[PDB]
């Protein structure tokens, strides 16, 4: 949909950072005269949709954790959790969470939704020791080690991240029976955004 | 420098398999190599391959089914008599039930079983699992 694209543009997910990462090349449309990398955006949309579908495919929504150690994605992830069923982590990920049975805050999901495999890399790594699939709202420069789905966005720009999250949530809602198509979803972006 | 094109090609193929490629550009094609590839295809290990004709030693690119465990040359193409085969195969390939030990034989290239069926052993090119 064009509307989604427009929204994205209004935010900033079209700009990825400098440093390209060869495996991310395909998602990037082209570099600019500045020294930045513009993401193909249609790809971002399609990928996002796919991710949403995958999320939906989980039987119960509660066992699909989401994560951002970033201060300004935390809010967004909380919102996402509230709206879908999914756990958020938000902030300090504990290294034993998906392996260490006996730990208090254990909780082993069927999907892991990272916001950035650069910063939230520990979580990603953990995903390997418990066969958790991992989708990642990753940048241009990010490492895609262990991530199954890479949604190309930007993570630097908190607003953009928030927008992306919102979009994902909307998609999931659409997939489920709760908000029918043709109707736009009521809740806004800014609601997801940090402050 | 090159010496045994075929060996190099096989190594390349093996590497590709290890990585988990799909396609792979075997860089100097050779009649022998082509034959080997055909044989492999026949016994299922390889998919299609598009021997591209330049105007030189051709390139092959070959379509892989994620199925090969290893394939290899055994340089010094030892002459091998029909009685001498069994020991060689025991030495080489992982099970009597499977894998193939490819001989060039005066009845074209064929696997150890084929050779046995025929009667002629010959010089031993390579193998796969």
């Amino acid at each position: 949909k064009e509307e989604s694209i427009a929204k994205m543009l209004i935010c900033k997910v079209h700009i990825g950072t400098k440093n390209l990462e060869n495996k991310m090349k395909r998602y990037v449309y082209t570099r600019a005269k500045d020294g930045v990398h513009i993401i193909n955006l249609a790809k971002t949309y399609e990928k996002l949709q796919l991710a949403a579908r995958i999320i939906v495919a989980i039987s119960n929504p509660a066992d699909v954790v989401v994560v951002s150690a970033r201060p300004f994605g935390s809010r967004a992830v909380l919102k996402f959790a509230q709206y879908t069923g999914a756990q958020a982590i938000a902030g300090r990920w504990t290294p034993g969470m998906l392996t260490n049975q006996i730990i208090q805050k254990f909780t082993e999901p069927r999907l892991l939704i990272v916001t950035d495999p650069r910063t939230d890399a520990q979580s990603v790594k953990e995903s390997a020791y418990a066969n958790i699939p991992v989708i990642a709202l990753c940048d241009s420069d990010s490492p895609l080690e262990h991530v199954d789905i890479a949604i190309p966005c930007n993570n630097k720009g908190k607003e953009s991240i928030a927008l992306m999250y919102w979009l994902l949530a909307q998609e999931v809602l659409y997939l489920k029976g709760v908000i029918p198509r043709s109707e736009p979803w009521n809740v806004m972006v800014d609601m997801f955004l940090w402050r | 420098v090159r010496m045994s094109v075929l060996a190099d090609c096989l190594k390349t193929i093996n590497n590709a398999e290890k990585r988990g490629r799909r396609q792979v550009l075997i860089r100097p094609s050779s009649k022998v190599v082509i034959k080997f590839l055909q044989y492999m295809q026949k016994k299922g290990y390889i998919g299609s391959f598009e021997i591209v004709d330049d105007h030189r030693s051709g390139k092959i690119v070959v379509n892989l089914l994620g199925r090969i465990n290893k394939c290899a040359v055994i340089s010094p193409r030892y002459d091998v008599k029909l009685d001498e085969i069994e020991k060689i195969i025991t030495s080489i390939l992982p099970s009597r039930l499977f894998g193939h030990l490819i001989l060039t034989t005066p009845y074209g290239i064929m696997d150890h079983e084929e050779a046995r069926r025929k009667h002629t052993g010959g010089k031993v090119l390579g193998f796969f699992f």
Binding site: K23, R26, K43, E46, K47, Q49, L50, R53, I54, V56, A57, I58, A128, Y129, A130, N131, I132, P133, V134, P143, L144, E145, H146, V147, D148, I149, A150, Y174, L175, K176, G177, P180, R181 | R19, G20, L65, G66, R67
Partner: protein
């Protein structure tokens, strides 16, 4: 006789103690966009995940089906 699982991408076939390797499940649509009951499935071996080719493999798989449309 447990017959092990073949990585849908690379066909490598994956043992019990692999973990790492994942069976990602993609839910279907029925005309509207609503979640159809059915689910199309891909197992992905650990090796590909480690490499980072996993995403590419997934894309290719999707293309092979109808699920997504660009290939790369």
């Amino acid at each position: 006789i447990y017959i092990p699982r073949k990585c849908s991408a690379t066909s490598r076939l994956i043992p019990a103690k692999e973990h790492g390797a994942v069976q990602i499940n993609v839910g279907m649509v029925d005309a509207n966009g609503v979640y159809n009951g059915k689910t199309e499935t891909f197992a992905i071996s650990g090796h590909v995940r480690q490499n980072g080719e996993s995403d590419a493999c997934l894309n290719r798989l999707m293309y092979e089906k109808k699920l997504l449309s660009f290939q790369n």
